[PDB]
Amino acid sequence: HMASMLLDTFQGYNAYSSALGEYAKQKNIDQVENIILSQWSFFFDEEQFYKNQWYTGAADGPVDVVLNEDLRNFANIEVLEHISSESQAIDEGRKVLEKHGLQIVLMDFYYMNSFNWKSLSRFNVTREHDPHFAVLTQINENSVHIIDPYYHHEENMSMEDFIKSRNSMTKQGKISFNSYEIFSNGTKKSNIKELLYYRFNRYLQEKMFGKITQFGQVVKKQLDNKDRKWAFTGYNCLNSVVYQHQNLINLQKKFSLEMPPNLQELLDNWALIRKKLFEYYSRGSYNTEEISNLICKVASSEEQFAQEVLKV
Ligand code: NI
Ligand code: NI
The missing domain is CATH 1.20.120 (Four Helix Bundle (Hemerythrin (Met), subunit A))
Structure with missing residues (x-):
């Protein structure tokens, strides 16, 4: 768990919107932040309630489909969900980092250290398999550097743990190295x-x-x-x-x-x-x-x- 002060990462209104907005801020993509900060939404899934899954709040998830529609409709920005494999995910990350400098990845929060699990034990906190969004910034020989924009943390994660986190079954379903490409064939200005x-x-x-x-x-x-x-x-x-x-x-x-x-x-x-x-x-x-x-x-x-x- 992180030594330094918290990062000034974009909060958004959920893990997904946080990651998209932080990516947009670092890469000077206009519209994305304003479209996130102007969102006004509420959902309730009575079926999800009785499965004790994430049953309410601003948006269903982990991928915020309504936000994806808003980004397409207001800014002509398409957020593409890519899937990869155990043998390919890291090489594909290397290509993305050389071109873009950042890769938005779906991760199992269980393996992340934004929460100080050791210290939280005392307070009857459980370490759960929840889907989360991180931003990969660097791939090294045996480790990677990730930012957690939603919780304002960053960490060096072992290659073993990174691959495990991105191939994990969560309470909401399976991760298979899912990543998020932000694309436009011609951006549009909203107000x-x-x-x-x-x-x-x-x-x-x-x-x-x-x-x-x-x-x-x-x-x-x-x-x-x-x-x-x-x-x-x-x-x-x-x-x-x-x-x-x-x-x-x-x-x-x-x-x-x-x-x-x-x-x-x-x-x-x-x-x-x-x-x-x-x-x-x-x-x-x-x-x-x-x-x-x-x-x-x-x-x-x-x-x-x-x-x-x-x-x-
Ligand atoms: Ni902390
Ligand atoms: Ni506390």
């Missing part, structure tokens, strides 16, 4: 007002606020206080929603946008939902009716907010 108008229109038309209500209604039905792991998953999933709210506050300041006056209050409500979910998971604090009521209140507040944003 902040267009990006927000399209996002907030889609949010209302697809009734994404309804998916918050669904999440809340499903929380209300968790009557078993002895099985709370869903609450930790929910806590982690909603980080993406907090990041979108903060990203929109930061867009408002940068571009002097007119916003409804309760954006910070909505962010605060999401932070409270996350606090109550974590403390419920951790030591059984609060109750599922209390948490459900708050999720259903924010659902209505988010519907109203999206309507008010589209008027201005």
Whole structure:
């Protein structure tokens, strides 16, 4: 685990958007960052909930397909998912690094050291096989250098561990050396007002606020206080929603946008939902009716907010 201070890597709103945005920043690719920072989305998969997979937040994953569509539609940027093999992945990395200097790779977070596993043991943290996105910067004789943009860490990983991480079965499915090529046959210029108008229109038309209500209604039905792991998953999933709210506050300041006056209050409500979910998971604090009521209140507040944003 890393000695130095944290890296000033692009946060985005999830691991995928973090990696795309950090890649775009380092390689001077315009549009990508603004398209990420203007995203406004919510999903809920009740099937994923009862499999205790990542069932809510800004976007399904690990690959953010809606973000890929936005990059194509707004900037004519195509993010191609390549698959490779145990015998080919490193040579293909060498070719990518010589041409581009960076390779975006799907990795099993289990093998990464952005989290100090030794020190976290004390706090009853488990080391899970979760998919994550890293940026490969260097291939050496027996090791590689990777950046973790989402967690603002970097490390030298053994060639053995790097290959293992990129060939691993995770809780969400199999990695086979997946990498992400950012391509344009002719980039297109988008604007902040267009990006927000399209996002907030889609949010209302697809009734994404309804998916918050669904999440809340499903929380209300968790009557078993002895099985709370869903609450930790929910806590982690909603980080993406907090990041979108903060990203929109930061867009408002940068571009002097007119916003409804309760954006910070909505962010605060999401932070409270996350606090109550974590403390419920951790030591059984609060109750599922209390948490459900708050999720259903924010659902209505988010519907109203999206309507008010589209008027201005
Ligand atoms: Ni650290
Ligand atoms: Ni800590």
